[PDB]
Amino acid sequence: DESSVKKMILTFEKRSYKNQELRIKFPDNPEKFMESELDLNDIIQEMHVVATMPDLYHLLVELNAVQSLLGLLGHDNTDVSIAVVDLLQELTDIDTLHESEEGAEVLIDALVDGQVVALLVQNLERLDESVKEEADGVHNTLAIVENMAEFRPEMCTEGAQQGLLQWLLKRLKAKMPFDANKLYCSEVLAILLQDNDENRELLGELDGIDVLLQQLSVFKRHNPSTAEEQEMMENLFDSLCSCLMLSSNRERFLKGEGLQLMNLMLREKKISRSSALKVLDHAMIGPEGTDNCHKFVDILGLRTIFPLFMKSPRKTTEKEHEEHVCSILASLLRNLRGQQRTRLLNKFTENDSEKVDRLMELHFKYLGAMQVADKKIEGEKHDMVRRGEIIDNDTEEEFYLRRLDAGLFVLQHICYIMAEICNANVPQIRQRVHQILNMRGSSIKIVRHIIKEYAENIGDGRSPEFRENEQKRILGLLENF
Template sequence: MERLDEQVKEEADGIYNTLAITENMAEFRPGLCTEAAQQGLMQWLLKRIKAKMPFDANKLYCSEILAILLQNNDNTRELLGEMDGIDVLLQQLSVFKRHNPSTAEEQEMMENLFDGLCSCLMLPTNRDRFLRGEGLQLMNLMLREKKMSRTSALKVLDHGMIGPEGADNCHKFVDILGLRTIFPLFMKTPKKMKKTGASEKEHEEHVCSIIASMLRNLKSQQRSRLLNKFTENDCEKVDRLMELHFKYLEAVQQADKRIEGEKHEMVRQGEILDDSMEDEFYLRRLDAGLFVLQLICYIMVEISNSGISQLQQRVHQILNLRGGSVKVVRHIMRGEQLYFLKSHQISQ
């Protein structure tokens, strides 16, 4: 493909068709794609994506192939990192910090690049490259600018800060005043999310996951700064946390009720509830909001055990006011069914 001139229509078409073959190969022979990436395909894709050429179908297709190559494949993720691909992705995405994509195709390319970046951040060594490439600063700017890139920037931050490997990114995020950006998004879910195809639940999940990651990873002064945020304005962020707790608690209880009804009906008809069925039911519970609920409960537990008495008092006060219970929180953390756990029946 290096020898083809995209100024010539036939040769540009040739590149497009080659990319189509690569896409098919990725579906049926993923091992060959990994090998192709190592034999020069990855290098060519990065070079083509960053080439100073007008946006066209081939650039869009390149972004799609790149995202596919990086899915569930640590070898290609490492390869991209070694080729300074994290910087290439960040440079290409920086265009969208103050400007929305001008067409649906350009928006699709932006989302492909974000997806590729999220995949890369699953690899710990790329977290460091992202940090050194000032990826946190770019994502933070995108959150402030309120453009279409904001939703995906939130997802990238979530991927970059999760787990013990995200500790350095968590500390840097606080240093660049990221708390001022993330907490307004926690306090109020933006209404203009339909354009980006993101749901309210996805937004709240990413925000809560970022806050939970910081509570896990931050030490000393930065951790104190995070906890102090919850005490501001008469603990308004604790009130919002508890509002989200009861919102998702109700959603999961409803899902558990439906699942329990289905199980009862299956048993009545003599069907066997095997492990695969139980896994499917669990996935449905997660989809209904169990994962977000567990994140919220983790945050509740962490701030209650922080040594700041007013935070613990506020959490317990709202739980008592709304018929909640610490025992229910423990059950949620363990992922147990909530349908039979009527909050008002369980005393603290």
């Protein structure tokens, strides 16, 4: 009922106005503003019905309420603020939101204009999670931000650095027992870090990496007791990984003893092992891992990793485990120099080159799978041709996915390792390689082809100069092998 709705908003806006006036005017007592406050509370509650029709979100904007509500977030009393937050949550709830086409956009825009996020942060900075009500408020705020994020992610960057990111770190860092709020915070932080480098940089600046390490480290020598705790842990790990997609952060991770903590996680063999592995991989990946690569060997990483290379936890699937391990190995071979490189190579000569044997075993495994996949793909293509279905970029994407699933990346890594290993002028290794290859009649040629293919697509999101360099380097392995 549209006229009625309109009337109702004015019902609040005046109340909103007058009660402010009351606050301003008569000297500071309960009685002279007090009864206003109850009125305010109840109107807000009533308005919670308003979220059923977002066809009517052209309204709230319309004259006065948007700014007024925002202004109310700083109210001298928490119960107004929390009510406001609640309203926003109901009002902002995506799941009831995503129907309305104009209704969504305007409100969000208004919020952005009013720098809603900053106000929310400010409000938070005065809450007290001892008081159940207040605690609910925090949760509500978090929910609201999640909702906003889902609708329009361009505000993520200014949302963080409106102080939100700094608040999140503080809440994580707080020596409080685990509760839903912490989990929510973790979730939000993770979301904030999805594909956004500015946010990552901000986190790095704020000593966020240190915080992440510390929070994580609990699960080194303990083990989440619940789905909730576990979920939180996972979120944290994800956040860390996201942060690591950025070079500056490699160094921060290094400084914060990230490498040591992940190696301890591996040694411990608790649940965090898989995540730790992933983190390690992320730390080491490109040129920008070199220092991390070198340090890993220094802290005896080789002793932790090669057992994992050799046998994969009876108990994340096996492929993933293999993928990460091999990835790490590849990284090490790319980047390592001096004594650490020598150390690495030595692990390919013990014990009668058993690791080379392992590598070749792996290669055959992956190769067979790849072949199978390839055949299937070919068949599909043929079928498409028969049916006159044109193969476009979506089709190619789909095909790529299949290959990925079969293990393309792992295979590529293996091939790379093999190439680098046979370029070490260590006869024993080379002989073992070639011996093994013809002996079962797979061929150098296949390996070469694979290498070439890998080179072709290397470096997806980086300077063209880089790509050509890397490709060239990889090709150079083929000369002496």
